[PDB]
Amino acid sequence: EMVDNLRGKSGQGYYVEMTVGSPPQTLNILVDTGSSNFAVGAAPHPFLHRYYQRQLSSTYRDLRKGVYVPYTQGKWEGELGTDLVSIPHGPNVTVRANIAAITESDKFFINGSNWEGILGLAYAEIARPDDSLEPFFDSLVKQTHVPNLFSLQLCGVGGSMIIGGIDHSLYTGSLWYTPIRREWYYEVIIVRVEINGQDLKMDCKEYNYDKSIVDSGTTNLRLPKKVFEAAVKSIKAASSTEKFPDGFWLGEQLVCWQAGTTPWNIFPVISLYLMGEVTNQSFRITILPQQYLRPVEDVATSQDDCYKFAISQSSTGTVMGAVIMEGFYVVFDRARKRIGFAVSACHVHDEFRTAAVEGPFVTLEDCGY
Numbered sequence: 299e300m301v302d303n304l305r306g307k308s309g310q311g312y313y314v315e316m317t318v319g320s321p322p323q324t325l326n327i328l329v330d331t332g333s334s335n336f337a338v339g340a341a342p343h344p345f346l347h348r349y350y351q352r353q354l355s356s357t358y359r360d361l362r363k364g365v366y367v368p369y370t371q372g373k374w375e376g377e378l379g380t381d382l383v384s385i386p387h388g389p390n391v392t393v394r395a396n397i398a399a400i401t402e403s404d405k406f407f408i409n410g411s412n413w414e415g416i417l418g419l420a421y422a423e424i425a426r427p428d429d430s431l432e433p434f435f436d437s438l439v440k441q442t443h444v445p446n447l448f449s450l451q452l453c454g455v456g457g458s459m460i461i462g463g464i465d466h467s468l469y470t471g472s473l474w475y476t477p478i479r480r481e482w483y484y485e486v487i488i489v490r491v492e493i494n495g496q497d498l499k500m501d502c503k504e505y506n507y508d509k510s511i512v513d514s515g516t517t518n519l520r521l522p523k524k525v526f527e528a529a530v531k532s533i534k535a536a537s538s539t540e541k542f543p544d545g546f547w548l549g550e551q552l553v554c555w556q557a558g559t560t561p562w563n564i565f566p567v568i569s570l571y572l573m574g575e576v577t578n579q580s581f582r583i584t585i586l587p588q589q590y591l592r593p594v595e596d597v598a599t600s601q602d603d604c605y606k607f608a609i610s611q612s613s614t615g616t617v618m619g620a621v622i623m624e625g626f627y628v629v630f631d632r633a634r635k636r637i638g639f640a641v642s643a644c645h646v647h648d649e650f651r652t653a654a655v656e657g658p659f660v661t662l663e664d665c666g667y
């Protein structure tokens with residue numbers, strides 16, 4: 299019943315249907331592992347099909363507290379309250395949770411994304427205005443007998459969010475676990491990066507400057523400047539039979555090929571080696587160009603297949619975004635403070651290569667900041 303409960307894409311976000319208030323008001327909500335507030339549009343907007351009308355809910359309680367969230371690309375603001383919340387294609391429960399009613403925003407809502415709010419699945423440490431605001435998943439666990447775990451199968455129906463468990467039909471092979479370094483974002487540690495089997499040969503701390511996170515609310519694989527520049531150099535060298543505009547590598551412009559002729563074989567695989575559950579042991583997640591080249595669907599360019607390079611520079615650490623998660627079944631095992639990865643039953647691949655999750659690997663220094 300929870301299988302296939304997500305819709306959406308890496309570019310615009312994956313979403314789950316939710317209900318807020320009594321009588322319930324149906325809303326589409328972005329599944330965001332990179333934030334911790336349950337924040338919903340609560341006032342009309344040109345990009346919103348519907349919104350939260352607190353006046354219609356008898357169960358709404360005003361917390362008499364404002365919330366202002368300016369971020370690098372834009373802002374959201376509104377006010378805090380609590381109300382009854384349910385996930386129609388999730389667990390069979392109703393919980394009372396904190397809700398940030400978004401009354402004003404700048405570059406937050408996306409035209410045609412089909413979502414009206416965000417379900418921030420990360421920890422209280424990063425909740426706004428401060429850490430006393432209990433995130434949704436914490437309320438769900440405290441109030442019910444739902445196990446403290448959730449899993450995400452993002453399929454480039456658009457995917458599945460399994461609350462309280464792991465669904466075996468969603469993956470193949472083994473689940474490999476990386477520890478959650480600190481409970482704020484879903485922070486992890488990358489120990490090694492290879493591009494077409496070639497080690498980038500950087501000190502492993504470089505990969506996690508200043509943190510590395512698993513974020514369903516970011517499109518791209520985002521890398522620290524030093525790592526990004528080496529990655530681009532290695533991908534350029536492997537795909538040298540074709541020369542693309544510099545705007546392509548900057549994730550600014552599209553690369554197009556006649557429909558059905560994308561030369562997948564000229565692009566390398568990228569392996570991210572994640573820290574294992576035991577000392578100096580690791581496992582690798584392998585990404586194909588089918589993951590790092592994000593198609594941009596547009597009827598006007600439809601004689602071709604056009605893509606954006608979905609690897610970009612970060613000044614805030616590594617972000618394993620939606621394009622990376624698309625290759626795998628990702629278990630957020632909060633109860634055991636660990637993140638599991640397994641090959642997704644829905645990942646996009648070809649007759650030559652498959653995305654992989656494999657290990658163990660042995661190295662004989664700490665890779666964290």
Ligand SMILES: COc1cccc(-c2cccc([C@H](NC(=N)N)c3ccncc3)c2)c1
Pocket residue numbers: 307308309310311312328330331332333367369406407408416513514515516517620
């Ligand atoms: C791949 O999914 C996507 C795609 C497109 C947009 C968004 C998205 C839209 C708005 C905000 C966020 C954004 N979430 C991030 N995790 N970066 C956020 C920022 C501040 N407060 C809460 C959440 C993310 C998420």
